[PDB]
């Protein structure tokens, strides 16, 4: 069974670098090229570039050109792909995909779970939680990307929508997330909301209450 | 060089069959293929060679088309074959066909909540217009504040579409000045939905 699996997520200031890597296993390393496709949130699909691995050889996109560079390791299965000279609207999910077809066109059977690579000029913060006393929680100035939000640590998953963020003018990140409840039990039954934004190590309990 | 797919957007229902479309604006070589993607995760491989199904893919996908229209088709939709689908030949990527369940309209609940004081000590207010639980999810949110309408200074966010009620929630925050905010009585956000008869407003005043 074919497996790609990349590094984890990065953030980056524009102007700087970054490097994903992407392991494979399961199938000969140096016999598929490895492909690089990334997508911008919200938006589709698009082509970077290709490696053989066993040759080393490359083919950039003509956008990329120039920008990116893309190496191999056999001995340890690993490809990479480095970016350099970043801009804001390069923040996507970057993927690695092989392509097992000799002939006719690029196929691409196997893919990694991706790598969110985040390009802002803002630097990281925790999240201000704010309550909404139907009820739930503002998590509201926060960068970058993502935070869990569960209720009673996850002992409530009924009812409950945590909706996607949405990026504020001031490059900061803000969402919301509800739960519905049966009025009867707000005098009695607590509702905590429990926000965790791992970037800043930030974790916040919030009691909300009518 | 572009590949053009159509509908945007396809809405059926569990059982009928879907017929997505990927046209080519140069007569190209017929290798194309189809991918399914769903939220949070890869894209995977259904269709290659525009009609050989890959390595356990139902045989209610199929593909077809050649030189510059391309289909794929799925035969009996089941609730778990509805996500996004690109078609790709070679380094060319289609926009993607968004595929939901279409189902009974339903009303949205519509909730309102005031800043909380504590963003109110911090001199910022943010107003939250909850609507939970509708279908389709083309919906218009507009903020009255003292009953004028309001652009500008707001933002929305939509849930992807439910799997075990199939509907979609949004969520819209104005956001002002605590000082922006105390200048006005009676904050609202007006909702225009199909499954509404009138468009639905929920207010609250700035007391109590």
């Known amino acids: 069974q074919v497996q790609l699996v990349q590094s984890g997520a990065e953030v980056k200031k524009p102007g700087a670098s970054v490097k994903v890597s992407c392991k494979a296993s399961g199938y000969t390393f140096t016999g598929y090229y490895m492909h690089w496709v990334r997508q911008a949130p919200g938006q589709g699909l698009e082509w970077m570039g290709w490696i053989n691995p066993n040759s080393g050889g490359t083919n950039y996109a003509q956008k990329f050109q120039g920008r990116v560079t893309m190496t191999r390791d056999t001995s340890i299965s690993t490809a990479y792909m480095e970016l350099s000279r970043l801009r804001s609207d390069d923040t996507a999910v970057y993927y690695c995909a092989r392509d097992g077809w000799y002939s006719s066109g690029w196929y691409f059977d196997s893919w990694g779970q991706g790598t969110l690579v985040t390009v802002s000029s803002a630097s990281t913060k925790g999240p201000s939680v704010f309550p909404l006393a139907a009820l739930g929680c503002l998590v509201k100035d926060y960068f970058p990307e993502p935070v869990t939000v569960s209720w009673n640590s996850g002992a409530l998953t009924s009812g409950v929508h945590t909706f996607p963020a949405v990026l504020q003018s001031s490059g900061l990140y803000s969402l919301s997330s509800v739960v519905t409840v049966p009025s009867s039990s707000l005098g009695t039954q607590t509702y905590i909301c429990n926000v965790n934004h791992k970037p800043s190590n930030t974790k916040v309990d919030k009691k909300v209450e009518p | 060089i572009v590949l053009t797919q159509s509908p945007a957007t396809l809405s059926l229902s569990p059982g009928e069959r879907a017929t997505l479309s990927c046209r080519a604006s140069?007569?190209?070589?017929?290798?194309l293929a189809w991918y399914q993607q769903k939220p949070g995760q890869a894209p995977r491989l259904l269709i290659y060679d525009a009609s050989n199904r890959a390595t356990g893919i139902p045989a209610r996908f199929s593909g077809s088309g050649s030189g510059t229209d391309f289909t794929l088709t799925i035969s009996s939709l089941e609730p778990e074959d509805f996500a996004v689908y690109y078609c790709?030949?070679?380094?060319?990527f289609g926009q993607g066909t968004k595929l939901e369940i279409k189902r009974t309209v339903a009303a949205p609940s519509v909730f309102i909540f005031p800043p909380s004081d504590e963003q109110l000590k911090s001199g910022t207010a943010s107003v939250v217009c909850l609507l939970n639980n509708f279908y389709p999810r083309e919906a218009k949110v507009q903020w009255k504040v003292d009953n004028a309408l309001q652009s500008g200074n707001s933002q929305e966010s939509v849930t992807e579409q439910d799997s075990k009620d199939s509907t979609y929630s949004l969520s819209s925050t104005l956001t002002l000045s605590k000082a922006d905010y105390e200048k006005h009585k009676v904050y609202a956000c007006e909702v225009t939905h199909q499954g509404l008869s009138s468009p639905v407003t929920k207010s609250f005043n700035r007391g109590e």
């Open positions: 140069q007569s190209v070589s017929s290798y």
């Open positions: 790709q030949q070679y380094e060319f």
